[PDB]
Design a protein around this ligand. Sequence first.
Ligand SMILES: *[C@@H]1O[C@H](CO)[C@@H](O[C@@H]2O[C@H](CO)[C@@H](O[C@@H]3O[C@H](CO)[C@@H](O[C@@H]4O[C@H](CO)[C@@H](O)[C@H](O)[C@H]4NC(C)=O)[C@H](O)[C@H]3NC(C)=O)[C@H](O)[C@H]2NC(C)=O)[C@H](O)[C@H]1NC(C)=O
Ligand SMILES: *[C@@H]1O[C@H](CO)[C@@H](O[C@@H]2O[C@H](CO)[C@@H](O[C@@H]3O[C@H](CO)[C@@H](O)[C@H](O)[C@H]3NC(C)=O)[C@H](O)[C@H]2NC(C)=O)[C@H](O)[C@H]1NC(C)=O
Ligand SMILES: *[C@@H]1O[C@H](CO)[C@@H](O[C@@H]2O[C@H](CO)[C@@H](O)[C@H](O)[C@H]2NC(C)=O)[C@H](O)[C@H]1NC(C)=O
Ligand SMILES: *[C@@H]1O[C@H](CO)[C@@H](O[C@@H]2O[C@H](CO)[C@@H](O)[C@H](O)[C@H]2NC(C)=O)[C@H](O)[C@H]1NC(C)=O
Ligand SMILES: *[C@@H]1O[C@H](CO)[C@@H](O[C@@H]2O[C@H](CO)[C@@H](O)[C@H](O)[C@H]2NC(C)=O)[C@H](O)[C@H]1NC(C)=O
Ligand SMILES: *[C@@H]1O[C@H](CO)[C@@H](O)[C@H](O)[C@H]1NC(C)=O
Ligand SMILES: *[C@@H]1O[C@H](CO)[C@@H](O)[C@H](O)[C@H]1NC(C)=O
Ligand SMILES: [Ca+2]
Length: 948
Amino acid sequence: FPSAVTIKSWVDKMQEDLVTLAKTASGVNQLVDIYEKYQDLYTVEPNNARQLVEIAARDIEKLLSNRSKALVRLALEAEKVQAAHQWREDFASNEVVYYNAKDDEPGSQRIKPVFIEDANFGRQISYQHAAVHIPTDIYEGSTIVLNELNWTSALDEVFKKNREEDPSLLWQVFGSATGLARYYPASPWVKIDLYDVRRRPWYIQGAASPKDMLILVDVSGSVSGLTLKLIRTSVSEMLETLSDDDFVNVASFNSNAQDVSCFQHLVQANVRNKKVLKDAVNNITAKGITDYKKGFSFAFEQLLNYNVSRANCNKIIMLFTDGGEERAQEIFNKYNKDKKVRVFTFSVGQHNYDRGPIQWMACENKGYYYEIPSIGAIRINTQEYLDVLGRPMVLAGDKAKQVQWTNVYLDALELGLVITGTLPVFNITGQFENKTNLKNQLILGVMGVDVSLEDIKRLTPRFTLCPNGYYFAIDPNGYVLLHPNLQPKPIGVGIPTINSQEPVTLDFLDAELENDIKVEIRNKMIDGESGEKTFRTLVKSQDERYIDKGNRTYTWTPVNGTDYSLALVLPTYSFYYIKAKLEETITQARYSETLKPDNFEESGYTFIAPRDYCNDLKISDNNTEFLLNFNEFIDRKTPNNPSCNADLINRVLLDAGFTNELVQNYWSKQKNIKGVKARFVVTDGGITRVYPKEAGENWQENPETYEDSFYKRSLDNDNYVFTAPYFNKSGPGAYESGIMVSKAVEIYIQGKLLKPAVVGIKIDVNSWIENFTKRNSDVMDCVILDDGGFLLMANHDDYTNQIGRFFGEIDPSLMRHLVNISVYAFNKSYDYQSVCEPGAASKQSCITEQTQYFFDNDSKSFSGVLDCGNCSRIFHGEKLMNTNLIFIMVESKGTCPCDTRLLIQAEQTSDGPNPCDMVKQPRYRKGPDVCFDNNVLEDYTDCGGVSG
Ligand SMILES: *[C@@H]1O[C@H](CO)[C@@H](O[C@@H]2O[C@H](CO)[C@@H](O[C@@H]3O[C@H](CO)[C@@H](O[C@@H]4O[C@H](CO)[C@@H](O)[C@H](O)[C@H]4NC(C)=O)[C@H](O)[C@H]3NC(C)=O)[C@H](O)[C@H]2NC(C)=O)[C@H](O)[C@H]1NC(C)=O
Ligand SMILES: *[C@@H]1O[C@H](CO)[C@@H](O[C@@H]2O[C@H](CO)[C@@H](O[C@@H]3O[C@H](CO)[C@@H](O)[C@H](O)[C@H]3NC(C)=O)[C@H](O)[C@H]2NC(C)=O)[C@H](O)[C@H]1NC(C)=O
Ligand SMILES: *[C@@H]1O[C@H](CO)[C@@H](O[C@@H]2O[C@H](CO)[C@@H](O)[C@H](O)[C@H]2NC(C)=O)[C@H](O)[C@H]1NC(C)=O
Ligand SMILES: *[C@@H]1O[C@H](CO)[C@@H](O[C@@H]2O[C@H](CO)[C@@H](O)[C@H](O)[C@H]2NC(C)=O)[C@H](O)[C@H]1NC(C)=O
Ligand SMILES: *[C@@H]1O[C@H](CO)[C@@H](O[C@@H]2O[C@H](CO)[C@@H](O)[C@H](O)[C@H]2NC(C)=O)[C@H](O)[C@H]1NC(C)=O
Ligand SMILES: *[C@@H]1O[C@H](CO)[C@@H](O)[C@H](O)[C@H]1NC(C)=O
Ligand SMILES: *[C@@H]1O[C@H](CO)[C@@H](O)[C@H](O)[C@H]1NC(C)=O
Ligand SMILES: [Ca+2]
């Protein structure tokens, strides 16, 4: 091949022939003057990070404090009404009136509501009464249910007062310990219905304090058969009652005690850790001699570790067995002489073995005894231990009445991602005399109010910041409360197979790329500190195909109301923004005609961003429909805009004149420029003005400019960015659409560098290959590629048919050597909110690894020898300056008859990372500071064996 000097000269002409075309046709240099000729039409305003985070954090406190006041109002009225209730035994004479949610009966009258449609909720609701959900295995009309349906009727007059005071109030619910849930407003319930209010995460978190469960499983020979698969089901059903604040481990014993999994100590019991225990429990076999002394010694020695992260709270042992004659009093007299550990015992299956020793362990230690004779008793009996664990919480008094917020989860009544407040309700009947204390140690139920994530996202406006700026808040666990990467889909825990139940818990470090600085930031935010940090990091693009570096200025502050912490990611070139200032109406009238669809023939195809201009307008998925309503809204409404905020209206209208000016003044001068398929401009305001109206059919970008991959990618780079096309019918037209070449504009007003908009062209392939010719050879092939290894041209004209495909998919030998020569670095990450086709053993959820490639260093010239084996291939690569393109000079593939394994850049389904070694060095976290257990006044004289 020609020497380096010849290649550099040859590629310099290509650089000078491609940059010039994009520089001139698009008009980036001439758009700055437009933004600099009309300075007095706007003004620049600062974006100070410190106030922005603290303003939003204070607003989040108020929103989370309004619902706290609504919770204490409901808990107070529920307590004082239950005391006044007089227990009855007949209801035929006095029929209770209520609306049953699950319907299309003597002893209880039903209601027929109006069910008008309403916003906020996505269903038909009725603000006149509260609906009741009764589980399908709980019989309405019983004395327990009917009595609960009576005294839980004064709650409706408190439900309306909360809604009238806070019109933005979402579901207010009362989860009763009987089993029925009463929620407001009334709506019909959402195959077979298996919903139980007592098993929901918001109910379990308010019914007891965090725990340190440790399951003991009897895997001796006597449990083989039916009673072994009941034990396996019961243990799995018990693990569903553990949140991320609880730490669990599963062990087994048959003349020898050992763990069922790879953990060997208490683990955080998140979604991934619980799936490992569920997989290991299903693979146990029943054989050997039972030995309770060695099984319990192992359990007691695992609850006394204190070397790892724990909950430092309720320490319980759940023993799943059948029966026996051994009491093991010496183990209990040695390990817990002061009874710091509760023991819960379960007798699974139908058998003739002694249960006396089993019931004895549950009475000496302050626990309970449960019986599971069939598969139908598994669900009820595996959630009743929370009644015992709540005894020290009730005796606490008003100290236990602390509002708690759950993890982000999906609402049962489909409403999106929500978090729920929580407040337990105590049975305080006969409190004046304080004499009964027999059933007053249990909670009546749990109060709860839902807060949608859209409500929180409204308190953190994002349109004043650049498209690369965003807010995010995290729990004191690392889980993000709000984040741009968080999606309303369940997370995956492995590879699915075919033969709302779990929270959407996504860590902050698993939402974006993980750095050493970000780990230090995450720990500081968890502790509840304030600070800032400016650093360089590589940020993934919108489409998981590119990675680019930039400067960020993470600023975080704590939220005083709760344990959350809020941070704002503000990059450079975003500390100032253009705020439109207007005092007339002729400019608005003049700019209104620019967006008329009938004028698109001469003004270009104009898009529009579906933002919240005001509540009267309706956001739709059809831009033409929503644009049509927008243009006949500025005029049909008075310019003062009593209900529409002028900040957003002035923003789009002002850019409607700037962008149209470029179209008319310059883009209208030339209508045919070589092989330019389309000229476009995307701005911060929200209008996109692709000039050829016919070419607008090929535009397949998001109408909202903030969610455009090329917009964010071009902002960081101070050069031209080439966007590779898609492949395999992912988009319409490979050569019928062109190659996008973005370019961000930059202006200086008063010494402040700003990036309002970007422009670009869509160069045709046919007009591009002819320039590259100066061809179908069988000796060597020359192509160009992009900061990611995607093909844009070809020499053999066989790779031309696959423009926009990863380079490693067609010539892995050279591609793999490029990584080894340090020109194309890469980093991999896991995507947990992904959907994939199932395997074999209906697209389920799974973890898919992602790989992105990028330039390693700033070196321009690359050359070397590729030794594929008994061959000699020598290449030469050169970087096209002012862009992200590189040109290589390598021989043909046919010279060396070597075909190595293909290199793939796509979402490959995986199952990692391995949690076996993740628990060895877990991420930093901070547990709750409250703890309620081992109360002296606790009765604990009511186990399940004394009665029987
Ligand atoms: C909050 O706590 C209070 C008390 O602290 C609690 O009110 C008490 O409710 C029970 C019912 O569960 C009342 O018991 C009365 O006396 C006996 C005992 O149950 C009942 O007679 C039979 O009992 C058996 C149980 O073994 C039952 O199967 C049978 O159906 C009953 N009836 C028969 C055989 O005909 C009485 O029926 C029952 N009711 C009376 C006498 O009116 C206590 O008297 C209640 N205590 C007080 C002080 O009122 C209340 O339920 C708790 N809150 C909630 C939500 O449960
Ligand atoms: C448990 O079951 C019953 C279902 O409605 C309710 O009992 C009814 O309570 C009403 C209000 O207390 C009574 O109406 C008034 O009662 C007062 C008694 O102090 C008197 O003025 C009159 O009896 C009556 N007033 C009128 C008719 O103008 C009902 O009489 C009474 N029904 C029966 C059969 O006793 C309970 O309210 C209900 N509990 C809850 C919490 O809703
Ligand atoms: C959360 O509360 C803390 C105090 O508990 C607030 O800290 C204040 O910070 C300002 C700015 O330096 C000081 O002038 C105040 O004196 C501080 N408060 C106190 C009580 O000393 C913090 O601002 C609060 N966070 C938000 C977002 O409002
Ligand atoms: C952590 O676990 C170890 C092992 O169970 C505890 O015991 C120590 O073990 C190491 C290694 O043999 C040595 O330091 C001593 O033999 C043991 N005692 C001490 C005081 O270290 C250990 O106590 C646990 N806790 C800590 C903080 O190490
Ligand atoms: C992203 O990729 C970079 C480059 O491939 C990696 O960071 C490099 O890691 C090696 C090994 O520790 C260091 O010798 C280099 O100095 C690093 N490059 C830097 C810091 O620019 C790593 O895979 C990713 N970078 C992260 C996670 O920060
Ligand atoms: C509710 O919260 C808002 C701020 O989000 C606050 O201004 C208001 O006072 C609170 N209370 C009511 C009744 O609106
Ligand atoms: C699409 O499937 C694979 C994936 O890229 C590709 O190799 C194949 O050639 C494509 N098939 C068609 C018909 O385009
Ligand atoms: Ca046995």
